């Protein structure tokens, strides 16, 4: 029983593949040998605890480095002219120009400038000194230690929970909606009201004076007497400076809307009310399902009773409760689908409605924070679709799902794949033809001959929000609508002042280039959805190979016969759609960074004239913003962007190195390693050294994964460098 | 910076010693015949 011990079939492999696949089949717990239901769910539960401990031990070190090597107090004194320091650098390979050039933010040595928005976050939430961040780091060290204790505890046989506890979906949803989403957002509200609002108003509220510092002039009297408007009585004025007592109000739960006029960020009183609202509604929504007390819902009978009587949905959702509850890949795919749609809702709502103080002014931090959640969301959504494919191979029972909606997806799967194919082809011919046409017209000396389409649907939606720039004047931009008159005394005085401003990123002025790149975005989502729906629905089998389910999920191919069956598996469709999410989110974040990099220095006409054709994208965005990127180090000297100039070139290595695994395939390298094995076995003084693992080439799935991971690492490092060097070196 | 010398200690151990601890202990572990 060698490594890997979870799979007996890989332990008898005498090659290097045994070393490789044991790393990659390490967390695929259900594919293990001598493996049961209880061990599956308990190992997944303790792996969740280890994941929670890693997240909290990560946050602890991102708090410890700000408290220890970062100037959080100096950034708190002046958040506009001080660069936030992540951590100090101890590199033995620096020369004296590198030590003298990485010393930023008034530090004593070479430090890294934090582009993660942790200073803006911790400032808005109430943390002011380094001692508060250190106490938070020790507290989250304790929390991660408690989660390690709980992870070890639930693997002990006294505290092992059974699968019936794990598959209790009603109790899990009630205690998740009530506890995880309700009492934590009500806990939050208690922080935002007790700590963050008085620290925005200058009052230092800590644990020593928690029971004495009253958050309102009349606290908990008007709450229980019903007059809640006392908590919205005296809001913060427009002369309020953040962190100071002057210009401040006393109301803890306002409904002002819009932005704080000095930080260009959301009001802590609004976010406190926001959390009291997504706390009351989640504790009320957490009393829905039936657990132990007679009242509630059984979701099995909800899904059984939700059948349309015309038969257009077949049996409806009958048999889907056992389908989700028995399949961990269905629950994980649903969780990652929801998580991608909310990690992208995170990205879309922290740039346009900045929630943290002095985050809108720090431009490259905002750029990093958008690109972060759009790449983490384009890998979470692809993981959702890949887990739908793994559900259809190793977890979907056609007998249990008989003529329900999930079986009817397989019944008309060629219609879904062909219509996603039509939509992708439509968007591709139209977007490419219009961009290439606008390229030809700028090439042929005639900018007026472009097909420029004003995006009047989304401009109509912006005028429906309150933008008076386009002059549609339908609702919330005209005073004759009932929605405006229902809102003009309640939230719209903040919202209209925030949306009619042209310096912020709240619902920006869009044009024909925005139309064209939104069809690029629709092309990217549609073609990624095409490959992923095609992988998920041809997961069990297809007309080329009907027994794809009996070959597992991530099998390489089926041989050169029947024309050729390369990339036939559903993992290979996931593999081909990782390139499409990289291209999609590359287009998304190209559009974001160029729409904002022209907004921040003022000349939005550069984007309005140049984004309609791809030579403007190549020249005015990829070439123009890379001026101080690749000049980070020269023969003459090196700048502070030099690490971002190396990380850019580094990306062009790793990405191109992926091509070595994605173009060249196995048997060339297998014969090459055969010649290498002969050469080592015949070389004098080196033949004495043996291998225990037989040297083989990388296997076919492993080759696609290694090329895909290299492609992804190079792709995220070329853009992390360019994006954090073409905004942080030319601020604006 | 509070203690400037812990950069000079932990970056050599977690950068040189700890991979030399981890990769040598794994190479023993992955090539155990058991």
């Amino acid at each position: 029983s060698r490594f890997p011990k979870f799979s007996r079939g890989l332990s008898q492999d005498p090659t290097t593949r045994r070393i490789w696949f044991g790393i990659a089949t390490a967390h695929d717990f259900e594919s293990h040998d001598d493996m049961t239901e209880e061990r599956l769910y308990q190992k997944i539960f303790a792996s969740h605890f280890g994941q929670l401990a890693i997240i909290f031990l990560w946050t602890s070190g991102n708090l410890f480095h700000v408290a220890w090597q970062g100037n959080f107090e100096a950034w708190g004194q002046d958040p506009l002219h001080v660069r936030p320091i992540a951590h100090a650098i101890w590199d033995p390979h620096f020369g004296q120009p590198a030590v003298e050039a990485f010393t930023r933010g008034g530090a004593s040595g070479p430090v890294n400038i934090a582009y993660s928005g942790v200073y803006q976050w911790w400032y808005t939430i109430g943390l002011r000194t380094n001692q508060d961040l250190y106490g938070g780091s020790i507290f989250l060290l304790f929390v991660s230690a408690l989660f390690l204790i709980a992870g070890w505890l639930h693997l002990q046989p006294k505290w092992k929970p059974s699968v019936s506890w794990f598959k209790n979906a009603e109790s899990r949803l009630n205690h998740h909606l009530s506890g995880l989403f309700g009492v934590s957002s009500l806990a939050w509200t208690g922080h935002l009201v007790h700590v963050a609002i008085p620290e925005s108003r200058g009052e230092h509220v800590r644990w020593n004076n928690l029971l004495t510092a009253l958050p309102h002039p009349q606290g908990l009297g008007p709450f229980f007497a019903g007059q809640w408007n006392v908590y919205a009585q005296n809001p913060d004025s427009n002369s309020h400076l953040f962190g100071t007592s002057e210009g401040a109000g006393t109301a803890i739960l306002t409904f002002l809307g819009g932005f704080h006029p000095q930080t260009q960020s959301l009001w802590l009183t609004d976010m406190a009310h926001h959390h009291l609202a997504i706390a009351v509604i989640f504790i009320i929504a957490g009393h829905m399902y039936r657990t132990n007390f007679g009242i509630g819902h059984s979701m099995k009978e909800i899904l059984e009773a939700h059948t349309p009587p015309g038969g257009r949905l077949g049996r409806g959702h009958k048999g889907l409760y056992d389908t989700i509850n028995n399949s961990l890949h269905f629950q994980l795919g649903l969780a990652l689908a929801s998580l991608g749609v909310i990690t992208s809702l995170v990205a879309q709502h922290m740039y346009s409605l900045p929630p943290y103080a002095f985050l809108a002014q720090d431009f490259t931090t905002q750029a990093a924070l958008y690109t972060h959640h759009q790449y983490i969301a384009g890998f979470i959504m692809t993981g959702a679709f890949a887990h739908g494919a793994i559900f259809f191979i190793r977890d979907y029972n056609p007998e249990q799902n008989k003529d329900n909606v999930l079986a009817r997806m397989l019944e008309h799967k060629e219609a879904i794949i062909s219509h996603l194919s039509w939509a992708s082809l439509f968007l591709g011919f139209h977007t490419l033809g219009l961009y290439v046409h606008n390229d030809v017209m700028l090439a042929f000396g005639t900018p007026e001959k472009q097909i420029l389409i004003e995006p009047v649907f989304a401009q109509w939606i912006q005028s429906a929000h309150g933008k008076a720039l386009y002059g549609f004047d339908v609702l919330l931009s005209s005073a004759d609508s009932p929605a405006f008159n229902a809102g003009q005394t309640l939230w719209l005085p903040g919202w209209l002042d925030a949306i009619n401003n042209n310096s912020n990123s709240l619902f920006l002025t869009i044009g024909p280039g925005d139309f064209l790149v939104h069809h690029a975005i629709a092309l990217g989502l549609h073609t990624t959805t095409l490959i992923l729906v095609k992988g998920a629905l041809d997961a069990r089998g297809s007309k080329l190979m009907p027994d794809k389910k009996e070959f597992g999920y991530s099998f390489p191919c089926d041989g050169p016969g029947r024309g050729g069956t390369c990339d036939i598996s559903a993992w290979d469709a996931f593999y081909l759609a990782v390139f499409w999410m990289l291209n999609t989110i590359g287009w998304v974040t190209f559009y974001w960074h160029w729409k904002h990099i022209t907004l921040w220095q003022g000349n939005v006409a550069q984007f309005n004239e140049s984004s309609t054709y791809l030579m403007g994208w190549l020249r005015d965005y990829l070439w123009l913003n890379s001026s101080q990127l690749i000049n980070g180090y020269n023969p003459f000297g090196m700048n502070s962007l030099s690490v971002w100039a190396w990380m850019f070139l580094f990306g062009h290595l790793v990405w191109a190195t992926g091509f070595m695994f994605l173009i060249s395939w196995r048997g060339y390298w297998q014969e090459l390693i055969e010649t290498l094995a002969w050469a080592h076995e015949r070389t004098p003084l080196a033949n004495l050294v043996r291998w225990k693992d037989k040297p083989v080439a990388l296997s076919i799935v492993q080759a696609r994964l290694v090329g895909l991971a290299h492609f992804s690492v190079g792709y995220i490092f070329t853009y992390a460098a360019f994006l954090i060097a073409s905004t942080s070196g030319k601020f604006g | 910076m509070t203690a400037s010398y812990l950069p000079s200690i932990f970056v050599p151990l977690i950068g040189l010693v700890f991979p030399a601890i981890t990769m040598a202990s794994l190479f023993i572990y992955i090539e155990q015949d058991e």
């Binding site: 001692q131 060290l141 230690a145 693997l155 | 509070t2």
Partner: peptide, 30 residues
């Protein structure tokens, strides 16, 4: 700014956390 002795408190509490991470990894093995 934080002090010298507070770094000692953090390093012990991370070493205690590193033991509890080592204890879970032994139990995840078994």
């Amino acid at each position: 700014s934080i002090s010298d002795s507070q770094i000692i408190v953090a390093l012990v509490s991370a070493f205690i956390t590193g033991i509890l991470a080592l204890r879970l990894g032994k139990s995840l093995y078994q």
